RNA sequence: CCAAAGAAGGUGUUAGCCCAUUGAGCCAUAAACCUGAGCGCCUCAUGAACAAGCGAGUAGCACUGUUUGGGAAUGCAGUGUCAAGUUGGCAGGUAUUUGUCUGCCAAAGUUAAAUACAGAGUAGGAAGACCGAUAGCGAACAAGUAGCGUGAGCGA
RNA sequence: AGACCUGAGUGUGGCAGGACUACCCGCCGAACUUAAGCAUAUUACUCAGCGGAGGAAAAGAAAACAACCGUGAUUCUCUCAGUGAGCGGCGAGCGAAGAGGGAACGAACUCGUUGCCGAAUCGGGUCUUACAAGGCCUUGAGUUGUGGCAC
């Protein structure tokens, strides 16, 4: 299945010719997630979150998102989260 | 131990017990009623 | 199973539920000793993961430390030498507070053998952690091919020694590679094998 | 071994060779570097030009064996060539062949009038080396 | 590294009529106020006082070596130089002294003292043996009290065959596979008197080779 | 004077030597060869203890993993799991019966991984497997001739029974061909070369 | 004259043969150790054959402090802030946002050997191109003694 | 009445404190010194200080390397390497890692979780020649979960 090598040194598919072997959800714990979050309510942050999901500034939000969380695909991702649970 | 011992020469139907088995009671919708203490700590 | 929902829920420690619970269990906490002992532990799911058992010789204690930065013990805040050495409330304590708890809670009750803790809780002033313990007396403890390990004397006082995991932690012993080659398997060691003079019988 | 050194010449000379006027003291021109560019500054200028100062990128984490590549030249092919191969080996004939990265080299180079024609495997040759190896009825095979 | 140094032992000052070295404190005592520290004072430390880390072993190129052995043999080989090394070889048959590897079936010391009179290496063990005396100076307090010379040397092609040669005085063994050049050239003095039996004496072709082979 | 010397970095600034105040930091190698003979001597008594088990465990043949030592060969660790099931053996049945066992290894390709099957078949096939009773043999152990036989496995490497590891052959010699005799090899490598050198540069021009 | 023993100690001068020393070998053995995982009886255990998940005030992030060769930050610590869930995380030595690839799966735990013994101990051993009574440990001797100091200590 | 659950008293059975501390593990932590001055740096993550264990300790079964034709827990040795790495009033100085040859190596296991069970568990009395990895009994502990089995 890997592209086999060329034979040489340099190039794309460089290196020396061997012939070659190819490399050898969690819906429960979603339900678990659910059911205690649906219990909880939400944390200060995801209420001042939906808070400017609300008012429309989603910049503000990913920027407070970024923030508290320290890293931008987190921040990304829980935006996306409140999104959704604002759709409900 | 008794039931036990005659048999070598299941048990009878009973409540689930335990936080362990009636959580998997719930879960696999076994239970018919479920009896919660109001003061675990 | 039970777990994955205690878990979760001791994920979300910044919920109302979970803030007012722990409102009232730290003011409780707040009214009590340094040291307490626990006939169960506050969280089992983290107890058990952590090696707790409910077994005759397991005991659970909470261990109270006091927050903040180490002022540094120099007469009227005053030190000598280089300006480099001359702060004294900006330094911080190079182990951490779990260690530091489990550490008190070795040395005041000597006839143990400290385990494993936990956080538990916090208030602005002080942290609590939930260290676990072991009667290596106990013969349930000495027949368990689980525990008995701790019996053996090397193992006494091993929190002392940065043994534990909060001990492992504030060593870098969570790294490997290129990110913990100076110290291990200590800094010492590696200062003794990175500064030693070798000499060659022929050289 | 001590006989021979010249405190044993020395000895009741009483000042072993350091002078009544300047003596042997301790450390007169300071420790080590000391000074390099203040009263040893000529010392360094003349002697260790391009001592101080910085030049050029930074590359961090060196792996030195992602960088291995010795070389040869076409007049030194002969050293790994058995004696006997080298003289059954003609222009037009059967040619030894001669693996460079299980000699310890990488890269063909080509210096000097190549005294044996053979096949080389080379990972790397320049591009003269090829020219001239071709030319005297040899030739390079790509290797990795 | 503690030894002349085990003492407090300051400087009294220029303020006093004495010398500047340092003294040792206190008082109720003889050495209360003695010099100390230096290498010049009684119960002081040595000059640069002698480590472990010094150059004890040396490392000699595989090549010298075996050209130092090949050529200690080639000497061994000329009974001129053997005479001149200080061996009693007048009597013995030729040199190099080739025997009968039948000598390797001794049992008894006597037949092996037979047989160095036999092949008259016995005028070279008996020089060794009145050659034994008391050394001369400290070494003898030392664990060397006895001295003597070297004598004849018998090369075995192996390790077995010595049962009867051992307790011989003045009488060393060699094996042909291992022989060694601080025995060939004792002193650095080349010219060893060599009893080869022929086996030994055979492998020595194989053993150092040709000049082109 | 200072003269004409090079610059000195000798790094002894340290209290590396010890003396009335220092404890010094060394290390002298004087037991180096009773460190020697005793290891020697352990070998032997642990050779004695295990007969006729070999005193090491059988290991594969492995690559070793750069641009600089990839034509080499060594020994590995332990064979992989992939390698014992071609084989035919179980991972926990291997490693009581003196084969090394390493479940980290992955076996990119097929020549590590037949080599190594090799390797585990040379060894099965003149493995003499000794009965737990005598009296009751079962099958694929060994017999009262066979156990008395024995014979230990002293090697250094414990490979005496599948050999040194092996390498590839040195190629016989041959004739230029003409695609060899008129081709620039140069040219060719020089491309490739080129071609994932400036594969960024050349996309991005070719995007605009 | 002995030597499979010449190997050094003792004995009123320098000893193979005056004495001791050792070789084969003999006797006795709590337990532990080694031995078809030594060998039986009882007892007890035991082998062979008839779908979901994976460790939370944790990892990160900010500031401060410290440590590191680790350089837009190698590890750690205090405080604030705090995840994700394999459509996932961590690492991949120039910060960021993208999208590919590779390795691995942290935040419980146990573990022999190869290594240390840089002023330790117990029981035995082997040595030295070392020192030779102002030397060598302070101490070859009723030496950590006699003596000194309120004392910590000093110390022949 | 009583219960549990939080906490006391006493009886019974046991353990800790002290010593050692060369090496080892955790903290704490200088200055002389070097820079021909000196403050960053250096000495040094050293001495001194506070704790802890052993016959070794510590480490250790990949959130490891690499970028290969790939390696494969830990520790140690040579080497990498006083380094055309890097850090540094880029001064004085400092300063490793992977790969390679080797020592060792029967080296691997446990829990938690998941899911199938659910007291099969522990302690205590007492029988077996037996404070049995055994039988019998036992509310004592344990269902706020001990113990079995499986990838
Ligand atoms: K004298
Ligand atoms: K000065
Ligand atoms: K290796
Ligand atoms: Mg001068
Ligand atoms: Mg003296
Ligand atoms: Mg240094
Ligand atoms: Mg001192
Ligand atoms: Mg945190
Ligand atoms: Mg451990
Ligand atoms: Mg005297
Ligand atoms: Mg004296
Ligand atoms: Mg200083
Ligand atoms: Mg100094
Ligand atoms: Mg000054
Ligand atoms: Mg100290
Ligand atoms: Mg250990
Ligand atoms: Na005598
Ligand atoms: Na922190
Ligand atoms: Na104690
Ligand atoms: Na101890």
Same mark, same amino acid.
């Given at each position: 299945?890997?592209?086999?090598?060329?034979?040489?040194?340099?190039?794309?598919?460089?290196?020396?010719?061997?012939?070659?072997?190819?490399?050898?959800?969690? /819906?429960?714990? !979603? &339900?678990? $997630?659910?059911?205690?979050?649906? =219990?909880?309510?939400?944390?200060?942050?995801? #209420?001042?979150?939906?808070?400017?999901?609300?008012?429309? /500034?989603?910049? !503000? &939000?990913? $920027?407070?998102?970024?923030?508290? =969380?320290?890293?931008?695909?987190?921040?990304? #991702?829980?935006?996306?989260?409140?999104?959704?649970?604002?759709?409900? | 131990?008794?039931?036990?011992?005659?048999?070598?020469?299941?048990?009878?139907?009973?409540?689930?017990?335990?936080?362990?088995?009636?959580?998997?009671?719930?879960?696999?919708?076994?239970?018919?009623?479920?009896?919660?203490?109001?003061?675990?700590? | 199973?039970?777990?994955?929902?205690?878990?979760?829920?001791?994920?979300?420690?910044?919920?109302?539920?979970?803030?007012?619970?722990?409102?009232?269990?730290?003011?409780?906490?707040?009214?009590?000793?340094?040291?307490?002992?626990?006939?169960?532990?506050?969280?089992?799911?983290?107890?058990?993961?952590?090696?707790?058992?409910?077994?005759?010789?397991?005991?659970?204690?909470?261990?109270?430390?006091?927050?903040?930065?180490?002022?540094?013990?120099?007469?009227?805040?005053?030190?000598?030498?280089?300006?480099?050495?001359?702060?004294?409330?900006?330094?911080?304590?190079?182990?951490?507070?779990?260690?530091?708890?489990?550490?008190?809670?070795?040395?005041?009750?000597?006839?143990?053998?400290?385990?494993?803790?936990?956080?538990?809780?916090?208030?602005?002033?002080?942290?609590?952690?939930?260290?676990?313990?072991?009667?290596?007396?106990?013969?349930?403890?000495?027949?368990?091919?689980?525990?008995?390990?701790?019996?053996?004397?090397?193992?006494?006082?091993?929190?002392?020694?940065?043994?534990?995991?909060?001990?492992?932690?504030?060593?870098?012993?969570?790294?490997?590679?290129?990110?913990?080659?100076?110290?291990?398997?200590?800094?010492?060691?590696?200062?003794?094998?990175?500064?030693?003079?070798?000499?060659?019988?022929?050289? | 071994?001590?006989?021979?050194?010249?405190?044993?010449?020395?000895?009741?000379?009483?000042?072993?060779?350091?002078?009544?006027?300047?003596?042997?003291?301790?450390?007169?021109?300071?420790?080590?570097?000391?000074?390099?560019?203040?009263?040893?500054?000529?010392?360094?200028?003349?002697?260790?030009?391009?001592?101080?100062?910085?030049?050029?990128?930074?590359?961090?984490?060196?792996?030195?064996?992602?960088?291995?590549?010795?070389?040869?030249?076409?007049?030194?092919?002969?050293?790994?060539?058995?004696?006997?191969?080298?003289?059954?080996?003609?222009?037009?004939?059967?040619?030894?062949?001669?693996?460079?990265?299980?000699?310890?080299?990488?890269?063909?180079?080509?210096?000097?009038?190549?005294?044996?024609?053979?096949?080389?495997?080379?990972?790397?040759?320049?591009?003269?080396?090829?020219?001239?190896?071709?030319?005297?009825?040899?030739?390079?095979?790509?290797?990795? | 590294?503690?030894?002349?140094?085990?003492?407090?032992?300051?400087?009294?000052?220029?303020?006093?009529?004495?010398?500047?070295?340092?003294?040792?404190?206190?008082?109720?005592?003889?050495?209360?106020?003695?010099?100390?520290?230096?290498?010049?004072?009684?119960?002081?430390?040595?000059?640069?006082?002698?480590?472990?880390?010094?150059?004890?072993?040396?490392?000699?190129?595989?090549?010298?070596?075996?050209?130092?052995?090949?050529?200690?043999?080639?000497?061994?080989?000329?009974?001129?130089?053997?005479?001149?090394?200080?061996?009693?070889?007048?009597?013995?048959?030729?040199?190099?002294?080739?025997?009968?590897?039948?000598?390797?079936?001794?049992?008894?010391?006597?037949?092996?003292?037979?047989?160095?009179?036999?092949?008259?290496?016995?005028?070279?063990?008996?020089?060794?043996?009145?050659?034994?005396?008391?050394?001369?100076?400290?070494?003898?307090?030392?664990?060397?009290?006895?001295?003597?010379?070297?004598?004849?040397?018998?090369?075995?092609?192996?390790?077995?065959?010595?049962?009867?040669?051992?307790?011989?005085?003045?009488?060393?063994?060699?094996?042909?596979?291992?022989?060694?050049?601080?025995?060939?050239?004792?002193?650095?003095?080349?010219?060893?008197?060599?009893?080869?039996?022929?086996?030994?004496?055979?492998?020595?072709?194989?053993?150092?080779?040709?000049?082109?082979? | 004077?200072?003269?004409?010397?090079?610059?000195?970095?000798?790094?002894?600034?340290?209290?590396?030597?010890?003396?009335?105040?220092?404890?010094?930091?060394?290390?002298?190698?004087?037991?180096?060869?009773?460190?020697?003979?005793?290891?020697?001597?352990?070998?032997?008594?642990?050779?004695?203890?295990?007969?006729?088990?070999?005193?090491?465990?059988?290991?594969?043949?492995?690559?070793?993993?750069?641009?600089?030592?990839?034509?080499?060969?060594?020994?590995?660790?332990?064979?992989?799991?992939?390698?014992?099931?071609?084989?035919?053996?179980?991972?926990?049945?291997?490693?009581?019966?003196?084969?090394?066992?390493?479940?980290?290894?992955?076996?990119?390709?097929?020549?590590?991984?037949?080599?190594?099957?090799?390797?585990?078949?040379?060894?099965?096939?003149?493995?003499?497997?000794?009965?737990?009773?005598?009296?009751?043999?079962?099958?694929?152990?060994?017999?009262?001739?066979?156990?008395?036989?024995?014979?230990?496995?002293?090697?250094?490497?414990?490979?005496?029974?599948?050999?040194?590891?092996?390498?590839?052959?040195?190629?016989?010699?041959?004739?230029?061909?003409?695609?060899?005799?008129?081709?620039?090899?140069?040219?060719?490598?020089?491309?490739?070369?080129?071609?994932?050198?400036?594969?960024?540069?050349?996309?991005?021009?070719?995007?605009?």
């Amino acid at each position: 299945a890997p592209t086999p090598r060329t034979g040489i040194i340099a190039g794309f598919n460089k290196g020396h010719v061997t012939t070659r072997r190819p490399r050898q959800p969690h /819906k429960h714990l !979603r &339900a678990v $997630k659910a059911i205690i979050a649906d =219990l909880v309510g939400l944390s200060p942050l995801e #209420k001042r979150v939906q808070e400017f999901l609300r008012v429309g /500034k989603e910049k !503000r &939000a990913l $920027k407070y998102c970024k923030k508290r =969380l320290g890293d931008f695909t987190a921040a990304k #991702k829980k935006r996306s989260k409140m999104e959704e649970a604002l759709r409900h | 131990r008794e039931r036990l011992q005659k048999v070598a020469e299941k048990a009878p139907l009973a409540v689930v017990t335990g936080l362990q088995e009636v959580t998997r009671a719930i879960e696999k919708k076994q239970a018919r009623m479920v009896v919660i203490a109001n003061n675990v700590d | 199973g039970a777990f994955m929902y205690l878990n979760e829920l001791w994920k979300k420690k910044s919920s109302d539920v979970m803030r007012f619970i722990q409102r009232i269990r730290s003011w409780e906490f707040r009214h009590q000793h340094t040291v307490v002992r626990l006939r169960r532990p506050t969280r089992p799911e983290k107890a058990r993961m952590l090696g707790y058992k409910t077994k005759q010789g397991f005991c659970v204690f909470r261990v109270r430390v006091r927050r903040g930065g180490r002022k540094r013990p120099v007469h009227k805040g005053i030190t000598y030498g280089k300006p480099k050495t001359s702060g004294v409330l900006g330094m911080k304590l190079n182990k951490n507070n779990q260690a530091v708890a489990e550490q008190r809670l070795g040395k005041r009750f000597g006839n143990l053998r400290v385990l494993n803790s936990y956080w538990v809780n916090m208030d602005s002033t002080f942290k609590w952690y939930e260290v676990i313990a072991v009667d290596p007396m106990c013969k349930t403890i000495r027949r368990d091919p689980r525990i008995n390990w701790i019996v053996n004397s090397v193992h006494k006082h091993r929190e002392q020694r940065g043994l534990t995991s909060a001990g492992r932690k504030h060593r870098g012993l969570r790294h490997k590679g290129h990110k913990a080659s100076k110290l291990r398997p200590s800094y010492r060691a590696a200062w003794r094998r990175n500064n030693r003079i070798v000499f060659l019988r022929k050289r | 071994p001590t006989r021979f050194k010249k405190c044993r010449h020395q000895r009741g000379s009483t000042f072993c060779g350091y002078g009544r006027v300047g003596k042997h003291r301790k450390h007169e021109s300071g420790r080590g570097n000391a000074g390099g560019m203040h009263h040893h500054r000529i010392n360094f200028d003349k002697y260790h030009p391009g001592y101080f100062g910085k030049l050029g990128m930074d590359h961090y984490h060196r792996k030195k064996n992602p960088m291995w590549k010795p070389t040869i030249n076409l007049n030194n092919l002969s050293r790994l060539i058995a004696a006997e191969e080298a003289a059954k080996a003609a222009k037009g004939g059967t040619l030894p062949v001669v693996d460079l990265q299980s000699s310890g080299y990488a890269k063909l180079l080509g210096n000097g009038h190549i005294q044996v024609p053979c096949i080389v495997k080379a990972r790397y040759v320049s591009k003269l080396a090829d020219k001239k190896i071709r030319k005297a009825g040899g030739a390079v095979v790509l290797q990795a | 590294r503690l030894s002349g140094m085990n003492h407090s032992a300051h400087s009294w000052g220029t303020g006093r009529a004495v010398a500047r070295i340092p003294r040792i404190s206190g008082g109720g005592t003889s050495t209360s106020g003695a010099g100390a520290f230096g290498n010049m004072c009684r119960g002081g430390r040595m000059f640069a006082p002698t480590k472990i880390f010094r150059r004890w072993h040396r490392k000699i190129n595989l090549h010298q070596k075996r050209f130092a052995v090949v050529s200690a043999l080639a000497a061994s080989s000329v009974p001129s130089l053997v005479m001149s090394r200080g061996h009693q070889i007048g009597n013995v048959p030729e040199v190099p002294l080739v025997v009968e590897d039948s000598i390797q079936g001794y049992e008894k010391t006597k037949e092996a003292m037979a047989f160095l009179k036999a092949i008259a290496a016995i005028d070279d063990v008996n020089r060794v043996n009145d050659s034994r005396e008391i050394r001369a100076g400290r070494g003898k307090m030392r664990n060397r009290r006895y001295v003597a010379r070297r004598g004849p040397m018998l090369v075995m092609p192996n390790n077995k065959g010595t049962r009867a040669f051992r307790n011989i005085f003045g009488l060393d063994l060699a094996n042909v596979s291992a022989l060694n050049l601080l025995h060939l050239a004792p002193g650095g003095h080349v010219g060893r008197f060599v009893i080869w039996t022929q086996s030994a004496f055979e492998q020595l072709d194989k053993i150092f080779g040709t000049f082109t082979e | 004077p200072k003269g004409n010397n090079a610059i000195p970095h000798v790094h002894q600034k340290k209290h590396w030597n010890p003396c009335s105040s220092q404890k010094g930091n060394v290390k002298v190698f004087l037991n180096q060869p009773a460190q020697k003979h005793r290891r020697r001597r352990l070998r032997l008594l642990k050779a004695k203890k295990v007969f006729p088990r070999p005193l090491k465990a059988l290991r594969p043949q492995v690559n070793c993993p750069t641009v600089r030592h990839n034509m080499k060969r060594r020994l590995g660790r332990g064979f992989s799991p992939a390698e014992l099931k071609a084989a035919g053996l179980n991972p926990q049945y291997a490693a009581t019966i003196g084969i090394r066992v390493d479940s980290r290894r992955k076996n990119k390709s097929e020549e590590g991984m037949n080599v190594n099957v090799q390797r585990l078949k040379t060894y099965m096939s003149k493995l003499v497997l000794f009965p737990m009773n005598h009296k009751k043999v079962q099958k694929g152990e060994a017999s009262e001739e066979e156990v008395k036989a024995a014979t230990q496995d002293r090697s250094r490497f414990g490979d005496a029974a599948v050999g040194a590891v092996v390498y590839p052959s040195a190629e016989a010699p041959r004739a230029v061909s003409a695609e060899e005799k008129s081709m620039c090899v140069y040219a060719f490598l020089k491309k490739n070369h080129s071609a994932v050198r400036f594969f960024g540069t050349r996309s991005s021009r070719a995007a605009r």
